PDB file of C-alpha atoms and ligand atoms in Angstrom:
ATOM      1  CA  UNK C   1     -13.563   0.568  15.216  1.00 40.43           C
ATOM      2  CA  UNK C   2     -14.024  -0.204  19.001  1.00 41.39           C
ATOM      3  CA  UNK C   3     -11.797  -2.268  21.250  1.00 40.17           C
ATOM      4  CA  UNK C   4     -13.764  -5.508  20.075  1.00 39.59           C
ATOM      5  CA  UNK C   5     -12.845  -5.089  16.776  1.00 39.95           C
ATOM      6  CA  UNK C   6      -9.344  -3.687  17.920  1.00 39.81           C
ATOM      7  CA  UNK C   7      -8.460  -6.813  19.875  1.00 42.96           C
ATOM      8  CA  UNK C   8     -10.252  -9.316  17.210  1.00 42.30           C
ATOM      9  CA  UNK C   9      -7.697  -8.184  14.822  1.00 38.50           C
ATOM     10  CA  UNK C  10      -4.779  -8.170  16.877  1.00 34.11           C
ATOM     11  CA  UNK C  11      -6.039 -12.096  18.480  1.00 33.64           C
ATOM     12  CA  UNK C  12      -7.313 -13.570  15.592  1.00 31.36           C
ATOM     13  CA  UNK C  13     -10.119 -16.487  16.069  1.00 34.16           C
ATOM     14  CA  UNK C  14      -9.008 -19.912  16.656  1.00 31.28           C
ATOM     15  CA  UNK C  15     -11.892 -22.377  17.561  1.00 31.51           C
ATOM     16  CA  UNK C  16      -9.383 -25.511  18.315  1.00 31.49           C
ATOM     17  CA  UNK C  17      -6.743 -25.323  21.516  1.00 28.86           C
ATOM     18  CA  UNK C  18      -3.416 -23.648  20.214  1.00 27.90           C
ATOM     19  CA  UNK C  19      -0.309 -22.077  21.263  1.00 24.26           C
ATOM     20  CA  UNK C  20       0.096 -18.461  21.773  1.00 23.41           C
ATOM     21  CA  UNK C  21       3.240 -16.328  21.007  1.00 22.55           C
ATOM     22  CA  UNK C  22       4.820 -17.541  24.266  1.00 24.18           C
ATOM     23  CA  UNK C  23       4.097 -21.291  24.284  1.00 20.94           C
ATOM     24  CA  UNK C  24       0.481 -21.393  26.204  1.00 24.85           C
ATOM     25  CA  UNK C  25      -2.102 -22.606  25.967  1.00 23.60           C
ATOM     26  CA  UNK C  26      -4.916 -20.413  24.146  1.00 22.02           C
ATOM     27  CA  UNK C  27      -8.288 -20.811  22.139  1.00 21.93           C
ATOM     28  CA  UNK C  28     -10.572 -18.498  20.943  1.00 21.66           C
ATOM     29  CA  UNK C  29      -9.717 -14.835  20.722  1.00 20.37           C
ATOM     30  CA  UNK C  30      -6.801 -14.622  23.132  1.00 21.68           C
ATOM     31  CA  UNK C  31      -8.488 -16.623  26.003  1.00 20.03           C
ATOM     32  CA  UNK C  32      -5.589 -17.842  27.969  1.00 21.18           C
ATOM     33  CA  UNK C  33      -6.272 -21.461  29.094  1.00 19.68           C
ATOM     34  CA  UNK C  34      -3.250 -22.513  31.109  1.00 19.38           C
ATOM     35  CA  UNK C  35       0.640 -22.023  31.104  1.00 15.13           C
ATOM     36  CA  UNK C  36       1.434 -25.119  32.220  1.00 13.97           C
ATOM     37  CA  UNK C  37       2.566 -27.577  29.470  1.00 16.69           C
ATOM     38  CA  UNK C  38       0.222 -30.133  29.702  1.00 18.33           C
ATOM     39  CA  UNK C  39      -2.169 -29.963  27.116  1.00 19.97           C
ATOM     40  CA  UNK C  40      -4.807 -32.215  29.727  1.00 16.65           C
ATOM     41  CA  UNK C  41      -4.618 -29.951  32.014  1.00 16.71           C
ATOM     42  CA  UNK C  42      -5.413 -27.104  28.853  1.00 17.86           C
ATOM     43  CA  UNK C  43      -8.158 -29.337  27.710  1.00 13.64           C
ATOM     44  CA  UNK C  44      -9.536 -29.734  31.454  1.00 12.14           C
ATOM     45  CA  UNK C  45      -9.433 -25.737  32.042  1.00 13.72           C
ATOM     46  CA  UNK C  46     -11.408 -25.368  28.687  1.00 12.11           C
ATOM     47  CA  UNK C  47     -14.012 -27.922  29.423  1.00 14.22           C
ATOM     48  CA  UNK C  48     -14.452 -25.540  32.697  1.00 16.16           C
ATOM     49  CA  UNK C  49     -14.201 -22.655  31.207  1.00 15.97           C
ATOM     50  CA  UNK C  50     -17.434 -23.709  29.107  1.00 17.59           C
ATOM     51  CA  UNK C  51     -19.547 -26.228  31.135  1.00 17.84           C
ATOM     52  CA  UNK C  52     -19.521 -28.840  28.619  1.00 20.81           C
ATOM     53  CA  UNK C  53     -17.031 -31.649  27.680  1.00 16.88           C
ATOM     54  CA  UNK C  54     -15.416 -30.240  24.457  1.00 17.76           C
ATOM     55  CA  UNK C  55     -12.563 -32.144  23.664  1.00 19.08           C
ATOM     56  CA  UNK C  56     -10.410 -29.226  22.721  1.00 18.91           C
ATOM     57  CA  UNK C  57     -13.023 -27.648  20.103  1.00 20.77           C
ATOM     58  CA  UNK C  58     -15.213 -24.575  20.847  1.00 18.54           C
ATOM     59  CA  UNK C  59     -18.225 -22.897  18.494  1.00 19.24           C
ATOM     60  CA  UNK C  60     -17.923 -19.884  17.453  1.00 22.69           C
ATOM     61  CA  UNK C  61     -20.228 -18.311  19.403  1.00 24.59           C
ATOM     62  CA  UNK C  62     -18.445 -20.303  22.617  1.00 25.47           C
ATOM     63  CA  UNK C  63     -15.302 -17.622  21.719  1.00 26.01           C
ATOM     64  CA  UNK C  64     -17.537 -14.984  22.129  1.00 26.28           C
ATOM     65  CA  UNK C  65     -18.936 -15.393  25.223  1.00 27.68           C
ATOM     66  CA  UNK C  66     -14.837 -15.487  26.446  1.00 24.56           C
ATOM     67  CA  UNK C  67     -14.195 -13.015  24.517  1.00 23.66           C
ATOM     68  CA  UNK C  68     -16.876 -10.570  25.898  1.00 23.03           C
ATOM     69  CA  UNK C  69     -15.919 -12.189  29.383  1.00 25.43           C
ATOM     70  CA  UNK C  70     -12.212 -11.236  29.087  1.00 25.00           C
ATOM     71  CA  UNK C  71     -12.502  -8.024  27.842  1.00 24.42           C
ATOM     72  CA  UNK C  72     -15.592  -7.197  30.857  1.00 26.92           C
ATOM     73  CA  UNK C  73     -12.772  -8.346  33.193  1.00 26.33           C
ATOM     74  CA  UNK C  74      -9.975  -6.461  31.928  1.00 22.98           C
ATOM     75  CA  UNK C  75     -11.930  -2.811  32.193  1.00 23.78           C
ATOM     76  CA  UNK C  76     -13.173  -4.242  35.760  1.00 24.88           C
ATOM     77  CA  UNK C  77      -9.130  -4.682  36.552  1.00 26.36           C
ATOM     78  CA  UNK C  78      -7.992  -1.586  35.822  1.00 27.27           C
ATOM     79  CA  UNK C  79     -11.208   0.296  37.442  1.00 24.95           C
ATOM     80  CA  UNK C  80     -10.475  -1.733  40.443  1.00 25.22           C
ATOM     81  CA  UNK C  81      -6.869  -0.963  39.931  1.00 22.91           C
ATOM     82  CA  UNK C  82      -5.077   2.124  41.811  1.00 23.02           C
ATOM     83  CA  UNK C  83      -2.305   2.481  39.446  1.00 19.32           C
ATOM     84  CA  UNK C  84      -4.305   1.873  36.221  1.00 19.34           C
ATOM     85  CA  UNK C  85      -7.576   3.859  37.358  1.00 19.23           C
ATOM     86  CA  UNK C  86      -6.299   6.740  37.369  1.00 20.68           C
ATOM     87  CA  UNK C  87      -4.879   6.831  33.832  1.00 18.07           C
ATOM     88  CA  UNK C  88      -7.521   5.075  32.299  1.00 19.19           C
ATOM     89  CA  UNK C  89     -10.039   8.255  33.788  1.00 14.58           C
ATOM     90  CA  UNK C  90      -7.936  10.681  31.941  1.00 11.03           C
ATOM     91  CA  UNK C  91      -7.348   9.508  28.894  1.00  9.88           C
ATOM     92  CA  UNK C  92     -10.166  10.131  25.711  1.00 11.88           C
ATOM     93  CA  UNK C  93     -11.811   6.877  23.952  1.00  9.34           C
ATOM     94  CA  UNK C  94      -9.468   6.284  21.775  1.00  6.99           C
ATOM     95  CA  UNK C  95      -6.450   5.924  24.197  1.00  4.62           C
ATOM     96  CA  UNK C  96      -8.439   3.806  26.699  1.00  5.01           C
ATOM     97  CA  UNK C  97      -8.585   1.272  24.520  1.00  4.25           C
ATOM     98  CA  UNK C  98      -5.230   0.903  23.766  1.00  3.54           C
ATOM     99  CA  UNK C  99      -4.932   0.493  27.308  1.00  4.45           C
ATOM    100  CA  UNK C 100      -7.698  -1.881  27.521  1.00  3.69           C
ATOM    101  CA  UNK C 101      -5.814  -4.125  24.631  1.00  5.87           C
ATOM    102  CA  UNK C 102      -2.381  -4.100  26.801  1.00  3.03           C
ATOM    103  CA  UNK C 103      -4.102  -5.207  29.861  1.00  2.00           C
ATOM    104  CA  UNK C 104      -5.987  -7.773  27.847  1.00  2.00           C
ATOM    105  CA  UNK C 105      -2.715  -9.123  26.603  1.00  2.00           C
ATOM    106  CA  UNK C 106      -0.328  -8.744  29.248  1.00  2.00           C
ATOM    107  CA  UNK C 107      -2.256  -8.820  32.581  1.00  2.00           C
ATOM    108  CA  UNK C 108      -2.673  -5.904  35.005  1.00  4.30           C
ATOM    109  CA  UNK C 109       0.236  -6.289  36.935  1.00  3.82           C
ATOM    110  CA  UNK C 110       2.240  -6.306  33.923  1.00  5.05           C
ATOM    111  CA  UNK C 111       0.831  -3.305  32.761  1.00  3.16           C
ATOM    112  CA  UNK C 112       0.889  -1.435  36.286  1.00  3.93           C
ATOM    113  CA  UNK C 113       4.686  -2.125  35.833  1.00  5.58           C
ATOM    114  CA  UNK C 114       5.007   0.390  33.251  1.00  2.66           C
ATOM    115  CA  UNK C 115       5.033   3.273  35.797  1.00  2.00           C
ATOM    116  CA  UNK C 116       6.926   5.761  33.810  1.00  3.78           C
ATOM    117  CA  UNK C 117       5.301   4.917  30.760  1.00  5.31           C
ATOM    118  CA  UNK C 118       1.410   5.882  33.187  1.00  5.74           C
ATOM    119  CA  UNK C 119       2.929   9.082  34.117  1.00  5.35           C
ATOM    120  CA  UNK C 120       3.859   9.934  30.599  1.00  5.12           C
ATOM    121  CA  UNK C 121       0.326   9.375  29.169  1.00  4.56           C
ATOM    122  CA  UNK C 122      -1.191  10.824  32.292  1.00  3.20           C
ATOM    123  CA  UNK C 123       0.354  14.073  31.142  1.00  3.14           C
ATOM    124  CA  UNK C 124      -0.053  13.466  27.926  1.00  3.70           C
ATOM    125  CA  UNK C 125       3.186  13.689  26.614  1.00  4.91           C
ATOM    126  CA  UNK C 126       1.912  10.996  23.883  1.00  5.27           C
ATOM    127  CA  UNK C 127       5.457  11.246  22.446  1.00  6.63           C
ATOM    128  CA  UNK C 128       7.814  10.616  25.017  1.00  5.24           C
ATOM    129  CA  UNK C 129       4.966   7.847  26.338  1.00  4.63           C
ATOM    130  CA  UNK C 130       5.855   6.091  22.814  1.00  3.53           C
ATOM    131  CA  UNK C 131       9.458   6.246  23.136  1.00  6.32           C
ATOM    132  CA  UNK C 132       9.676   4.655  27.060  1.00  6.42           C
ATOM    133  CA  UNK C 133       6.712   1.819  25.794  1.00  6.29           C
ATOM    134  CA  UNK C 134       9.065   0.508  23.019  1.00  5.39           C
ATOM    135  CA  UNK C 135      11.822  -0.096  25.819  1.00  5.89           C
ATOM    136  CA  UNK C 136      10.319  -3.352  26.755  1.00  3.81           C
ATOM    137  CA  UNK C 137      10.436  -6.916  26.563  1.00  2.14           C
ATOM    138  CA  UNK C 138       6.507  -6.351  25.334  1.00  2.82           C
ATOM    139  CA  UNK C 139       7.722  -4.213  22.096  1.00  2.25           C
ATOM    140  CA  UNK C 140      10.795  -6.908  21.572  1.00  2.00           C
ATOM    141  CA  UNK C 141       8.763  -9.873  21.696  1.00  2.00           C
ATOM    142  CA  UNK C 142       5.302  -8.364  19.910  1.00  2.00           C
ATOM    143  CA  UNK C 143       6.408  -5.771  17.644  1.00  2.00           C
ATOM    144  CA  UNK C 144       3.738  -5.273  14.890  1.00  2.00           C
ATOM    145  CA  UNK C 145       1.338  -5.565  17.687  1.00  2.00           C
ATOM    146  CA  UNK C 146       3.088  -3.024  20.251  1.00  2.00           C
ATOM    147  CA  UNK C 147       3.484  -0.563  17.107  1.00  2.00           C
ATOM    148  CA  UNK C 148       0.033  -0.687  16.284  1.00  2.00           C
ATOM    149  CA  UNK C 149      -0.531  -0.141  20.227  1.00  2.00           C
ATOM    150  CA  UNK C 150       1.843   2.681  20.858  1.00  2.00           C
ATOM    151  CA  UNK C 151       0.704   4.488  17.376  1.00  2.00           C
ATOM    152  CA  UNK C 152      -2.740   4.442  19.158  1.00  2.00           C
ATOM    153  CA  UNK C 153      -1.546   6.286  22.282  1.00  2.00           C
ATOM    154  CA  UNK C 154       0.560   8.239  20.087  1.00  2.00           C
ATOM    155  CA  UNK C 155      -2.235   9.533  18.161  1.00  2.00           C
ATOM    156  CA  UNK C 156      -5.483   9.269  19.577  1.00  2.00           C
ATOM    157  CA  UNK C 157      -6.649   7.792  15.876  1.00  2.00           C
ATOM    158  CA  UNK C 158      -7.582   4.339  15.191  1.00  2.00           C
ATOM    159  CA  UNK C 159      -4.909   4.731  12.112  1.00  2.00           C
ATOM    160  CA  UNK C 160      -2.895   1.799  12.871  1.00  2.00           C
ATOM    161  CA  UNK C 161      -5.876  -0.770  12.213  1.00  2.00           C
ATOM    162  CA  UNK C 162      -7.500   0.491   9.545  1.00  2.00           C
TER     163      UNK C 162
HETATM  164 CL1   CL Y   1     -13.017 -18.447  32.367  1.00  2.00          CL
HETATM  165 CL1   CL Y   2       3.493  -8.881  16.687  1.00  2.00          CL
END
């Protein structure tokens, strides 16, 4: 398991525009298009995104090259990040991973909001870091996926996905 495989399972692989779990736009594996409602303005950002006129429909191979984009950016955000750095440098493989997938998901400000929840793995009290992560709008909204997350900091085992 690695966090490709990690975050293909928890994405899934949709070649044709579609909705994600909070109404935006999306294709691929978890490539955010836009969040505003048009779906011209989704089509537009995708048709950027890939330097060809697509008409809402991407190759497989097209997902890739996001995905491997996306998840290059999000370990370049939280290297480049003060608050995330930091954490990311102490924890082992496994962990930073899980870290990579909430930052993938949620953004890097969102995640350098959970500032209790840093400490806590910093000092890997794995734990008490579960507990506080489950207090969020995150765990409420996602739940399978924020279980399988938190198991992964709880554990340091790639348990929850196989
Ligand atoms: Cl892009
Ligand atoms: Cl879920």
């Amino acid at each position: 398991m690695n966090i490709f495989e990690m975050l293909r399972i928890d994405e899934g692989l949709r070649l044709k525009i579609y909705k994600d779990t909070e109404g935006y736009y999306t294709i691929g594996i978890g490539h955010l298009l836009t969040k505003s409602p048009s779906l011209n303005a989704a089509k537009s950002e995708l048709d950027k995104a890939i330097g060809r006129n697509t008409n809402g429909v991407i190759t497989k191979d097209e997902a890739e090259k996001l995905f491997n984009q996306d998840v290059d950016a999000a370990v370049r955000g939280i290297l480049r990040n003060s608050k995330l750095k930091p954490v990311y440098d102490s924890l082992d493989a496994v962990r930073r991973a899980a870290l990579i997938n909430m930052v993938f998901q949620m953004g890097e400000t969102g995640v350098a909001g959970f500032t209790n929840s840093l400490r806590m793995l910093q000092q890997k009290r794995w734990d008490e870091a579960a507990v506080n992560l489950a207090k969020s709008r995150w765990y409420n909204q996602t739940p399978n996926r924020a279980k399988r997350v938190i198991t992964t900091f709880r554990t340091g085992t790639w348990d929850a996905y196989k």
